[PDB]
Design a protein around this ligand. Structure first.
Ligand SMILES: Brc1c(Br)c(Br)c2c(Br)n[nH]c2c1Br
Length: 327
């Protein structure tokens, strides 16, 4: 398998761009940045709103839990490479505690509203708008030879007053090299592509497009998360019970992939459930034929079939957002 677009980005660029292990970090001054309050946590970091004491400007301070050199350089190099791109979080500085060597990444501040309370208040137009801005970020990172590999609402910071969006946490991100076999233990469960769940390692940017489809289905149908699996086997089961097993079987044979016998047993046999079956009274003002056509074009087993970010941005679903932006 290879990506249908941007396959050659890292091939044409100098080795320094993608050879992240050759990076030598340029540490800033820890004392420039003070923690104001904790705003988040995860497996790999704690996150705080802070202040730059020099200019009194707000920032985000991401304090990293103990991390391998190879891995931190990967996140830093990716951040540096993408800094300035549309709707990409801006890494401002990198600093470390002198005693413990605990590193902190310093970002532009974004005045985020919790997706769990934000999303239910979004208008149909709002959803179109924010999904479009998120697509800008993904087309950009893909065009620069990077897969994000952890698209989910938790990684999309939305300042809803300034109508602004940032794709954050490039901790799981990777350079795309044609034919490279990648680790499948990426993304977060509810957003993992079938490729991950069936051990197809030679995946590409299209992975992010499945995750985006899952986020989108969550929004229009008001079903958070959309595919609610308990473990990675059950995740494939949940998907199979919507998309049906025939399409799964065609996918598997195309890539010459066999399911673990135990997984095959769990998946069983299932017919396709039309998207309209998820419509109900709560969500109804959100679920037009344009919404559905677009969602259907994202949520495909076959990664090679899904819309590219560039394509998605042109889908008629977003025609009002483009018209407004053109002005
Ligand atoms: Br970077 C970054 C930014 Br910007 C924001 Br705002 C938040 C929040 Br709010 N939680 N975690 C965050 C991370 Br990581």
């Amino acid at each position: 398998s290879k990506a249908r677009v941007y396959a050659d980005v890292n091939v044409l660029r100098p080795k320094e761009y993608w050879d992240y292990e050759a990076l030598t970090v340029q540490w800033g001054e820890q004392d420039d940045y003070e923690v104001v309050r904790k705003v988040g946590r995860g497996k790999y970091s704690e996150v705080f709103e802070g202040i730059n004491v020099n200019n009194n400007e707000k920032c985000i301070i991401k304090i990293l839990k103990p991390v391998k050199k190879k891995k931190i350089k990967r996140e830093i190099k990716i951040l540096q490479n993408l800094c300035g791109g549309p709707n990409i979080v801006k890494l401002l500085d990198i600093v470390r505690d002198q005693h413990s060597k605990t590193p902190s990444l310093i970002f532009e501040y974004v005045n985020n509203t919790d997706f769990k309370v934000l999303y239910p208040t979004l208008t149909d137009y709002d959803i179109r708008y924010y999904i479009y801005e998120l697509l800008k970020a993904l087309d950009y990172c893909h065009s620069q030879g990077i897969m994000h590999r952890d698209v989910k609402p938790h990684n999309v910071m939305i300042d809803h007053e300034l109508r602004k969006l940032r794709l954050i946490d490039w901790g799981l991100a990777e350079f795309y090299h044609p034919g490279k076999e990648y680790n499948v233990r990426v993304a977060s469960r509810y957003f993992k592509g079938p490729e991950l769940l069936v051990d197809l390692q030679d995946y590409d940017y299209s992975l992010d497009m499945w995750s985006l489809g899952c986020m989108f289905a969550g929004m229009i149908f008001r079903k958070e998360p959309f595919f609610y699996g308990h473990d990675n086997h059950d995740q494939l089961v949940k998907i199979a019970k919507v998309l049906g097993t025939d399409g799964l079987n065609v996918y598997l044979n195309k890539y010459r992939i066999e399911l673990d016998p135990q997984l095959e047993a769990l998946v069983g046999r299932h017919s396709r459930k039309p998207w309209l079956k998820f419509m109900n009274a709560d969500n109804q003002h959100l679920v037009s034929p344009e919404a559905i056509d677009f969602l259907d074009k994202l949520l495909r087993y076959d990664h090679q079939e899904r819309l590219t970010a560039l394509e998605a941005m042109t889908h008629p679903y977003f025609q009002q957002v483009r018209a407004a932006e053109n002005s």
